[PDB]
Amino acid sequence: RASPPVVPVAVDKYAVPVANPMDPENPNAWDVTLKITTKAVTVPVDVVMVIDQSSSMGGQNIARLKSAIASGQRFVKKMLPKGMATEGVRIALVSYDHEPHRLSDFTKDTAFLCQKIRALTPIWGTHTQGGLKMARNIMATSTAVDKHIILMSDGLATEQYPVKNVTTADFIGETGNANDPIDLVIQGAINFPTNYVSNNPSTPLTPNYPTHSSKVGRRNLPESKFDYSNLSARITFDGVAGALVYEPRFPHPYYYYFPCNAAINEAQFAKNSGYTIHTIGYDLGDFALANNSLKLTATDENHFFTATPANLAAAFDNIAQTINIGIQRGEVTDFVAPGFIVKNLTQSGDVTHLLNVSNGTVHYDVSTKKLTWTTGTILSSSEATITYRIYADLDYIQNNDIPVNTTSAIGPDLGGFDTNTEAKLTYTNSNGESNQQLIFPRPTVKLGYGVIKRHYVLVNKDGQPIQANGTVVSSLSEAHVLQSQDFFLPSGGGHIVPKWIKLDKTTEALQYYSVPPTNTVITTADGKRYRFVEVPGSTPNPGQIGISWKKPAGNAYFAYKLLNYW
Ligand SMILES: [Ca+2]
Ligand SMILES: [Mg+2]
């Protein structure tokens, strides 16, 4: 009925630099993981144990109470396995004879509960309704999701509360089902009248005894029909009670209170409040009235069992539920940031098998650089992850003044470029509430390696950049290319052949290198020869070229003009 607590969810994201070994295609590489973690929920559950300590559980039958005492302690310890540190579970304790006794309010104190169970002692009278009423009183203060009453009895109730403004309509005759407690108690009292029907053998007063036409107390009276003002109140005839209590104010064919039915009636009020009722029958001789009364008192017949060693050992193994699902539905949107590309993602569509994906499926849109991860259901106490490799696009970073992230603190490089513009989980939580949202952390990175490209271009006589046909252009980057571009690698350690110049990540100041052309004379395929010149805008021999983690792609433009041999 009440909703359990929601399973906690948390998200994390981080970029791990690719190292030992570095990525061979591009050392500016990071493995980015997005991670969803679910925790756990124990559903709160309150239990009231109700134990029959009536005289029928003692004397000749003392193995009954002894078994209730042994099994009740076992149940307490099974449901409170960590004692006062047990999450979610509390147990209260009621005993009863001719009146109920509140032995413990709700507690996790297993030693206290077991001590009270060990002190049970047989006392005349079996006021099962009263035990159940006290359990209902105790359970009324519970705010648990699950609420259980466990009744441990030999099943023959012999006392009950008075019925207000009692009339003949508060009683009922044989149902025609020989196994109904009504029919059983009537037949039983016909066969064994002095075992069933309230009578003090010491006094001359005697009840009228029942026949097949007699009427016994109903089990479906409204709660307003019982007088609960005194929780030790009884119905008696001739100063005593019994499995049937004669009501002398009503005539032939004779009317009898039926405590087993009153207890079923009282349990119905508990069921109407949403409580689960378990009954355990300690009369192992198969007395149908007792067992069948306890079956009807329980939530259903499967919540009754006889107190055999095997049934007792197996009972109440997991009274506390744990929530199985942490996320019912989830969608992670992850926009990769400018300057970074995802390894091997060339077209839109399903990229699940191009990434490492623990759960669900991943879609990629090339134009927006957006990963959409459909998680599916994620269980509690679990983690779901996707991991993909990104590379830095050096020429894009060179050509664009990308902002740095000065707010995130997770690294790996504080103050670096974002790997993600935004990543968000939208999900349906463990109770089915949709549109829950969590924002992932923002990794930041600085490039570790740059490049220096050397270009070999044509100028005219007057030092102007030109196309091959002589038309002047605005910049050397537009001029005719005479020789394939190549890369420059300085001396010193830390650089990676063929082109990767190790960068100083601790500064934004350009690191300058002395870059020479590979050659100062170029002879083309057509036999024309070109000689190196230093002109406005062009790189001298050698020339200072600077790179940094923010501007990692330097470009030298070496100018050449035609050598004319006539
Ligand atoms: Ca008598
Ligand atoms: Mg008894």
Gap from CA of 53 to ligand 2 centroid (Å): 7
Resolution in A: 1.8
Residue 102's DSSP bridge partners are 94
The continuous run of DSSP H or E covering 103 comes out as strand 100-107
Q: How many other C-beta atoms lie within 10 A of the C-beta of residue 343?
A: 16
296 neighbors 264 (Cβ within 8 angstroms): yes
Ligand nearest to the CA of 205: 1
Q: Which of 498, 505, 460, 500 is nearest to 482 (CA)?
A: 460
Q: Can you name the residues that pair with 112 across neighbouring β-strands?
A: none
CA of 62 to the centre of ligand 2 (A): 11
Alpha-carbon separation of residue 261 from 158, 162, 178, 257, 289 (angstroms): 10, 13, 15, 9, 10
Return the half-sphere exposure (C-beta side, CA atoms, 13 A cut-off) of residue 275. 32
Rounded distance from Cα 216 to ligand 1 centre (Å):
21
| Neighbouring C-beta atoms of residue 511, cutoff 10 Å | 17
Q: What 3 state SS string does 11-59 have?
A: EEEEEEECCCCCCCCCCCEEEEEEEEEECCCECCEEEEEEEECEHHHCH
Q: Which residues surround the ion ligand 1 when the cut-off is CB under 5 Å?
A: 200, 203, 205, 238
Beta bridge partners of 31: 16, 389
Q: What ligand is nearest to the CA atom of residue 200? A: 1
CB of 134 closer than 8 Å to CB of 102: yes
Please give the Cα distance from 545 to 555 (Å, whole number). 7
Distance CA 14, CA 34 (A): 7
Distance 239 CA to ligand 1 centre (A): 9
CA angle 372, 26, 343 (to 5 degrees): 20
C-alpha 210/C-alpha 188 separation (Å) is 10
CA distance 266 to 272: 10
**Distance from residue 228's CA to the centre of ligand 2 (Å):** 21
Ligand 1 centroid to residue 97 C-alpha, Å: 22
- What is the signed CA dihedral for 500, 502, 505, 508, rounded to 10 degrees? -80
CATH code at 9-41+329-445? 2.60.40.2110
Q: How far is the CA of 58 from the centre of ligand 2 (A)?
A: 9
Question: Which ligand is closest in space to the CA of residue 203?
Answer: 1
Question: Any idea which ligand is nearest the CA of 57?
Answer: 2
Ligand 2 centre distance from Cα of residue 65 (Å): 10
Q: How long a stretch of residues is the chain?
A: 566
- Separation between Cα atoms, residue 122 and residue 363, nearest integer Å: 71
Q: At what angle do helices 110-118 and 62-79 cross, to 10 degrees?
A: 180
Question: What is the topology classification, in CATH, of domain 45-314?
Answer: Rossmann fold (3.40.50)
CA distances, 42 to each of 200, 332, 492 (Å): 53, 27, 61
Q: Which ligand has the minimum distance to the alpha carbon of residue 198?
A: 1
Q: Do domains 9-41+329-445 and 45-314 have the same CATH topology?
A: no
Report the alpha-carbon distance of residue 171 to residue 285 in Å, rounded. 29
Reported as type and span, the H/E element at residue 335 is strand 325-336
Distance 246 CA to ligand 1 centre (A): 12
CB 485 within 8 A of CB 554: no
C-alpha 155 – ligand 2 centre gap (Å):
7
Instruction: Return d(Cα 388, Cα 357) in angstroms, integer.
Output: 9
Residues 307/278, Cβ–Cβ less than 8 Å? no
Instruction: Answer whether the bond into residue 552 is a cis peptide, omega within 30°.
Output: no
Which ligand is in closest contact with the Cα of 125?
2
Q: How far apart are CA 358 and CA 387, in angstroms?
A: 9
Secondary structure (3-state) at 113 = helix
Kindly give the distance from the C-alpha atom of residue 57 to the centroid of ligand 2, in angstroms, as a whole number.
6
Structural domain spans, the chain = 9-41+329-445, 45-314, 449-562
Residue in the block written with tokens 């159940």: 132
- Cα of 91 vs its chain's centroid, Å: 25
Which amino acid type is present at position 161? Y
> 75: which 2 tokens?
């149940």
Task: Kindly write down the DSSP assignment for every residue of 59-71, as one continuous string.
Answer: GGGHHHHHHHHHH
- DSSP H helices, 458-508, are none
Count other C-beta atoms under 10 Å from residue 40's C-beta.
14
Which residues, including other chains, have CB under 8 Å from residue 399's CB and lie 6 or more apart?
Answer: none
Integer Cα distance of 281 and 64 in angstroms: 9
Compute the distance between CA of residue 401 and CA of residue 448 in angstroms, rounded to an integer: 18
How far, CA to CA in Å, does 79 sit from each of 83, 87, 89, 118, 419? 9, 10, 7, 18, 50
